[PDB]
From a paper:
Colicin E1 is a bacteriocin produced by E. coli that enters the periplasm of neighboring cells and forms a pore on the cytoplasmic membrane leading to membrane depolarization and cell death. Unlike any of the other E colicins, the T domain of Colicin E1 binds to TolC, the outer membrane component of the acridine efflux pump, and the R domain binds BtuB, the primary receptor shared by all E colicins.
We find that colicin E1 binds stably to TolC, not as a helical hairpin but as a single-pass folded helix with the N-terminus inside the periplasm. The ColE1 T domain inserts into TolC with its amino terminus pointing inwards through the periplasmic iris, and 2D class averages show that the carboxy terminus of the helix continues and projects out into the extracellular space. The ColE1 chain binds TolC asymmetrically, primarily contacting only one of the three TolC chains. However, our cryoEM reconstruction of colicin E1 in complex with TolC shows that ColE1-T hinges open at the TolC box to an extended conformation upon binding to TolC (bottom). Compared to the unbound state, asymmetric ColE1 binding dilates the periplasmic TolC aperture and, makes only minor adjustments to the loops on the extracellular aperture so that they can accommodate ColE1 in the absence of any other proteins or motive force. The acidic patch of colicin E1 near the extracellular aperture contains two arginine residues (R129 and R131) that form hydrogen bond networks with one TolC chain each. In addition, colicin E1 residues T113, A116, N119, and N120 (all part of the TolC box) establish polar interactions with TolC residues G67, D69, S90, and K305 on one TolC chain (light red and light blue) while colicin H117 interacts with TolC F310 on a neighboring TolC chain (light red and light gold). By contrast with the β-barrel of TolC, in the interior of the periplasmic helical barrel of TolC, colicin E1 does not make full contact with the α-helical barrel interior and there is a gap between the two proteins.
Residue numbers in the entry:
A (entry chain D): 46 to 131
B (entry chain B), C (entry chain C), D (entry chain A): 23 to 450
Amino acid sequence: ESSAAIHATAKWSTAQLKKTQAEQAARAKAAAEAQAKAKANRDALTQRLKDIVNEALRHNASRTPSATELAHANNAAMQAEDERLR
Amino acid sequence: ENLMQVYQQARLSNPELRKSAADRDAAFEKINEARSPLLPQLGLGADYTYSNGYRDANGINSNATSASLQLTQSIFDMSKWRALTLQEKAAGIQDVTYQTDQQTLILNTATAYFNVLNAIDVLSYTQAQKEAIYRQLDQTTQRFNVGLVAITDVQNARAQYDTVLANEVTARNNLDNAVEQLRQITGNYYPELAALNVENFKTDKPQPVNALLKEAEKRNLSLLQARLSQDLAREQIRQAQDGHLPTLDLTASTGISDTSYSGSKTRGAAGTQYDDSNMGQNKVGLSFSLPIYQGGMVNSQVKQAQYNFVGASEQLESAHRSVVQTVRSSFNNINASISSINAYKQAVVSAQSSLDAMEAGYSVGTRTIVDVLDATTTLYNAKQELANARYNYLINQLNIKSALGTLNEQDLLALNNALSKPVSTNPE
Amino acid sequence: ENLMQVYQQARLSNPELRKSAADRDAAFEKINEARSPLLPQLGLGADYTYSNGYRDANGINSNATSASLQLTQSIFDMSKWRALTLQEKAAGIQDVTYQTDQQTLILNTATAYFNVLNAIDVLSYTQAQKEAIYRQLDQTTQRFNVGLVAITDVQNARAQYDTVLANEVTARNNLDNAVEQLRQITGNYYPELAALNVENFKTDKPQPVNALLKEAEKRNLSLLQARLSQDLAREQIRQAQDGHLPTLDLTASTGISDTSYSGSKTRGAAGTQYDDSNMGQNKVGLSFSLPIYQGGMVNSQVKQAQYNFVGASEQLESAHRSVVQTVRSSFNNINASISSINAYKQAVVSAQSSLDAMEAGYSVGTRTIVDVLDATTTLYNAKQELANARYNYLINQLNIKSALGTLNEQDLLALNNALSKPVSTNPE
Amino acid sequence: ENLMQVYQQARLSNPELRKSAADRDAAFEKINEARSPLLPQLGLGADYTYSNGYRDANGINSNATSASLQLTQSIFDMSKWRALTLQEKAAGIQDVTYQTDQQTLILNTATAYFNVLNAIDVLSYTQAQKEAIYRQLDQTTQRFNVGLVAITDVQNARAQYDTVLANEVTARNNLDNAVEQLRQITGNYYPELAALNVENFKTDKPQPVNALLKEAEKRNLSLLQARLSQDLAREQIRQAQDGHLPTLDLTASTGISDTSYSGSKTRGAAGTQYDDSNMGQNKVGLSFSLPIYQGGMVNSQVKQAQYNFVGASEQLESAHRSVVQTVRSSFNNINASISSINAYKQAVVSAQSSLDAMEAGYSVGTRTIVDVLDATTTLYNAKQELANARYNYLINQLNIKSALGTLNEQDLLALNNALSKPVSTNPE
């Protein structure tokens, strides 16, 4: 009976479509998750390279006195030389 | 709009790209902050002081004030030069970050555009399937009322029609969500998009995967960023090691100072010595420093920097394995989408050649018209699979170019030439 | 318990929210640390020193010791006022973060509660489907033993029963795991939950999307946090710009010292220069500072702060687009859940009408057992879709209140009013 | 290779674990940096200056120089002992982080290996289903050439066969992409893997969930890391509180200097104030400091540390709920995979018994080829789910060992005992 081939093909075809839709949804979800992880990793790297240099500049800014601290030390040293002659 | 026109509106307005451009420009501006400690520093400092002596110093009060300009510049300080070269490398890593955020906007714009077209097609096939099932349901209902057909075929046709109505609501909601994803990327809503030219559409074969691997190893942005990150980790070994070096600074100043005295011990003849005093000084000085030993600190910092560089060199192997897998899986997916388009094209043509014979002979009287209803499902299943396979080929054809790192506006132009007639994003 | 009682336990119990409350309280207490540099700074120093002169000063020895109570108070330094007002803004940003964690605990508690109820219903329909298929396996086995049907009908019913048995094991595992997600949120196991009153349940149409958007854009916590983050980035420009300004501090001190001398050059008539001393000193003084030039450092810091504010203004556009898409998708998903509930409500009745006709069709021999098993499985599938659609409507009915930023326990009370009969989380 | 041999190549080469090992060893070398400020600091300073007086200091000029080797040693500074102790605790937290990466490489290697074996079986069953569907296309073509059936039956057989070809393409693509993911973990392509010995495969019942959970509570690495993180936050309270304590440093210096004077005012009877000098100073001293009031700063820091410890103690409760849910869900999924293996093993024999009846019925000609097709497609669906369930059981047997925190290579040896004959990763 020809109808039995039509019924079998209709039912089996619809199962292959539903399988393909489930695969397509899983494929889209996995790609979106991988992109979100990669974006978060680039943001973390962006903060790391910023903090590496900010810490190196903070260290260089504290390896020595500042121009203000040296001006205040000189202001004291003028008075210390006056008090040597006093 | 077509895909190219949609991409121009995205490129001009998209905040993900425009934030990344601002975060890049800030890193290039920080090169001047990192340069600045090598240049002449200049400041004014000034003071006033009252003082009152007691306990042996009793009966001496004093009033003093002074000011000076102070110049400073490093003559030799490699730790400052390393802070500059690290910022030049950090800005380079940030530019490759911006190139990656720029390149991914292209892929996301095309993905959103083809998701809207795919949702329009899935809705259109669901509506075409519904109307075909409804025509068969109606004809079965007439044949039942004439007494030619048993009510069980009308009940089955109602179950088919009622479940396809729930599928149309689902397909409609998928389209009405997809256009808002396109709005979020592009900043705009579109009443109609240029559809895929399926009447002329054809698939090209990719390059052999050995050529794709050799190309990606030259130009992939994630691998390039990993190479630059390894070099920044290597420069941090030198920035640690240079902590052992001597340091030399030039300083220069012009200062002025005044002082007076008061109180009982400064009165009378003692006021000859505790007289008012005035001073100015110009001076120049070279200050030198050399750390001889620091509890082993710099030797630990060098070993930490060496382990950080080992970590960065393994992170480059991680990046290399990742791009190798990405071009190979993209090459597989292009060959799979090409061969499955060819399979589903023949499945649609044979299902159409079936349905064109079924809808004649089984309407005329060969067997129940529920066989035309079942034959209809095979065709609209196959048309949905074929349409979805075409959009998978188009998306993978951009995806492989993102894996090469070459993906740019000329690839959107190449895909935009595969579009033609406009279709509305909002059916009646 | 009902949904309200589950939430009133979760609100008190949940560590994720209580951790967020601790981070909020820490960010507010840190305002006082940010205030401290504007208040008096006060400490005691003390010293002791031996000294031995060698070359020229050869054989002048001395010993000195001192103590000094010291005070400092800043009179003008805008960087400390910026640091305070930036911490007050950072605390405000942490409070809207805590409000978002408080609001998302409600949505997670409701989502877990409805996932358990949905799993109880999926298991219940799977057991009912298994028993209906078992009744047909028994009836066809009897008909086969009487000789009314071939053994192939029993083989079809048996294979269909054995595959639905494997689905019941799967449905039971989905329920058993869903209850552990509810335990992870609430801290508690529950033997029974109040089920949805499907006899009295009815859907309500949402407000028009323009009114939802107009309310969300003035209440959504993610958008509010982005506005506060842009305002913080604007204050960071002022923090950079104020780096050009002068600075003025007040200082005060009360010192005491002792000093004594020894060695060959301090004996005899020369000893009158040395002797000993006991000086006390009060001091009060102002110290002024003005950076004149710093290699362009502050100009780079200002331009970096401006690019950071541009990045924050694009972060606000990103938040605004995200709210628009979240409100529009939630409004569409509500309308889709309402219309699909009314589709499946009909599809269950026509599937049941089809099954009643199909078992009659098999009894008169115009259908096969496989048609009855398909009519059975399509009916129990339509029941599972209808039940699932009600829970998706209830979750989306909270999701739009989350998109509006208004979601609170009064919405849980409104949903809890639709619950009635207790059903066990752990059936026999 | 078998799974044990694959894991040797993974453990030797894998960049994720090797990068984690470098990040662990860096944190242990940082203990030597954290200890270094407690040890003697030693530095050579040197100086040269020219000076030129003006305004009553007019006609006084000077050249001066110094060299000074100087030493510092803390006698009491509790903040340094706290900073060392915090780095030893941070290194301990990093060691259990590395131990978690070492453990998760095992689970990832086994998961990737079983994904390849599962894809080989899915492809093999898809090719068996293709071989069965081809018999319909053959029979309809022969019967059409005999003139016994219409062209419609060939067109539907072609539409079905061209669709199972699209499924073979999909299965083959999934096998290729599984092998690329295994090659990312392991660094290697394998032509052959050792397959599961399904003829001697044996399900085994887990320990009771109370015994599993009582072991996991002593042993789980994420819970141990949360306990160590709470203890670090508790040490940070002591590190904040000890900011109220006094400080005491020793220092020493072997200083040398030279000085001379020039200009008109340096000459004549006042020249005793302006004579040449060569003085050295060999000195040793103690320096004490005690903050008395700091605008409440240390009390804000102590309360911030107390809120941080409250936050860390709620992270420990969150970790405890996470391992409870992970152990219970692993125990559920072992019992469910064991039960569903038994269910699908019966379903395969049941569907095989149905197919053996249809195949005999088709061979004598009382049944149709589409009866055999329906029996074969349902059988290979059952065989595919039985294979899928076996690999899920084997993965869940590692997942409970991961939840216990005991997972190590002896669990891969226990799996490797169930592996046997080599199968090609890339068939004909």
